[PDB]
Design a protein around this ligand. Structure first.
Ligand SMILES: [Zn+2]
Ligand SMILES: [Zn+2]
Ligand SMILES: [Zn+2]
Ligand SMILES: [Zn+2]
Ligand SMILES: [Zn+2]
Length: 213
């Protein structure tokens, strides 16, 4: 496929098929990759970067897909900045929506907790990343740190796990009594019924699956 990117040489540009009517410069032997976020081609400089840390990262270190954001700035409605060190990743203004088990009732309790104290999702992440680094909190992508360079999606995923543990560590006396009165759901955090408003309001889902007595 003929590909022309922001950094392709002018002679390549003019040689493409015309439309229908009613510092770096890509070399000839070089290849392009499509940014996973915006689908725009960029020069594929990953191999070069393996022996040259001066080249900007072009992939998520968790999922290993390519992203253009650190390389030359990505732009798309919906993209907040799709590749960044975890501690600097922009998760967007609505990152707390359904942040707990995709459960808006549990999420809103948390939002209230934070709003009450003037805390932002940012302060909460910062505090969580401290616990993570000491081994107090854990991640499924267990080797991720605040310094890991990753994508919006992989960062969001670990942010949900960290946020869950943050919520878990809030004392029951710091939450409305309307919250702490609710009985634990037998099925705990992975309950499938909690996407229904009535069940979600009635039972607490910040807990683990009930096994024996
Ligand atoms: Zn190019
Ligand atoms: Zn990723
Ligand atoms: Zn992009
Ligand atoms: Zn992007
Ligand atoms: Zn339930």
């Amino acid at each position: 496929p003929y590909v022309v990117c922001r950094q392709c040489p002018e002679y390549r540009r003019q040689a493409a098929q015309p439309p229908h009517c009613p510092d770096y410069v890509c070399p000839l032997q070089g290849s392009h990759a499509l940014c996973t976020c915006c689908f725009q081609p960029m020069p594929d400089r990953r191999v070069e970067r393996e022996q040259d840390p001066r080249v900007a990262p072009q992939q998520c270190a968790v999922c290993l897909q390519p992203f253009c954001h650190l390389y030359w700035g990505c732009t798309r409605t919906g993209c907040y900045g799709c590749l960044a060190p975890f501690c600097e990743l922009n998760l967007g203004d609505k990152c707390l929506d359904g942040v707990l088990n995709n459960n808006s009732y549990e999420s809103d309790i948390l939002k209230n907790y934070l709003a009450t104290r003037g805390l932002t999702w940012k302060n909460m992440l910062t505090e969580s990343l401290v616990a993570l680094q000491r081994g107090v909190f854990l991640l499924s992508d267990y080797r991720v740190t605040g310094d890991t360079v990753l994508c919006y999606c992989c960062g969001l995923r670990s942010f949900r796990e960290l946020t869950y543990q943050y919520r878990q560590n809030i004392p029951a006396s710091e939450l409305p009594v309307a919250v702490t009165s609710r009985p634990d759901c037998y099925w705990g955090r992975n309950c499938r019924t909690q996407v229904k408003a009535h069940h979600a309001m009635k039972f607490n889902h910040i807990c683990e699956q009930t096994r024996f007595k």
